């Protein structure tokens, strides 16, 4: 409730499509008053409760409510919100550098030290979010973007807060959602969820970052899920032959089934691999 009612086209020029999901499309746009470039996320409203072809207003308002709070170098910022008959339109800080892993895939090689420089930025972003009791709940390589890929030290921005939740002290939250490869066993098993689920996903991201292989990815969705639940993974010599003992220890402390024994974001930043 209380989103801008004006025609967004009266205030922005729209450009190329940047990405699209089942119920959303992101496009480049330019604010007319300033000439500054932004991103516009057009979210389809479901409009009727029985419809499966759009997003519930509860979900839309939850994402907007969280984005409104956020101001940090490694997380996307919200500029404006518009609404018309069919869509809610989020005007967001533009991140034009593409996915982190596409950038890395074009490099000649990448040392562990160099890898940890990008990972530290992700850690810094999540540290901010967890400090505000916000769980992202959809951390995966495609939601790790670069602001500008054409600078000496490219900056990471975490995007897509469609699944994000404020962790409420008084009531457990359970749900099954997210991408099988990257979700924690508590999500798979419909158990109580919290900030800890993000740290598991960071462990998966770190594993792929160093090896280019995915730790739990099986030959069917159900097999992937079973791998996750049983924490069935290996540092395959083919992929991890040049990886340090400390890097493996970092990952092992994150890919822990019991959320209460999993390394926290605060502790991950003090781990000797990250803070020598
Ligand atoms: C997709 O959901 C969001 C995207 C963004 C966001 C903000 C600024 C921004 N600049 C560029 C992009 C961008 C560029 C390319 C692709 C995408 C993304 O929508 N692609 C799909 C990501 N995920 C849903 C697989 C997003 N974004 N995306 C922010 C909050 C969101 O909930």
Numbering used by the authors: 2 to 277
Task: Give sentences copied directly from the paper behind this entry.
Death-associated protein kinase 1 (DAPK1) has been associated with N-methyl-d-aspartate (NMDA) receptor-mediated excitotoxicity, and has recently been suggested as a target for the treatment of stroke. DAPK1 has been associated with cell death mediated by apoptosis and has been suggested as a novel target for treatment of stroke because of its involvement in NMDA receptor-mediated excitotoxicity, which is believed to be the major cause of brain damage following a stroke. In particular both kinases harbor a calmodulin-binding sequence and an autoregulatory domain (ARD) next to the catalytic domain and are therefore regulated by calmodulin (or proteins with calmodulin-like domains).
We established a high-throughput screening assay for the protein kinase DAPK1 by using a Caliper microfluidics capillary electrophoresis system (Caliper Life Sciences/PerkinElmer) and identified a novel small-molecule imidazo-pyramidazine inhibitor (6) targeting the catalytic domain of DAPK1. Therefore, we verified the inhibitory activity of 6 towards DAPK1 in a different assay: the equilibrium dissociation constant (Kd) of 6 was determined by ITC to be 0.24±0.09 μm, thus verifying that 6 indeed binds DAPK1 at nanomolar concentrations. Finally, we were interested in the binding mode of 6 to DAPK1, and we therefore co-crystallized DAPK1 with 6. All residues were clearly visible in the electron density map, with the exception of the C-terminal residues Lys278 to Ser285, which were disordered in the structure. After initial molecular replacement, electron density corresponding to a bound ligand was immediately visible at the ATP binding pocket, and following several rounds of refinement the structure of 6 was modelled into the electron density with high confidence. The electron density for the dimethylamino-ethylamide moiety of 6 was weak in relation to the aromatic part, most likely due to increased flexibility of this part of the molecule in general, and specifically this moiety extended outwards from the binding pocket and did not interact with DAPK1. In contrast, the heterocyclic part of 6 was relatively planar and slotted into the ATP binding pocket in a manner typical for type I ATP-competitive kinase inhibitors: it formed a key hydrogen bond between the backbone amide of Val96 in the kinase hinge region and N-7 of the imidazo-pyramidazine portion of the ligand.
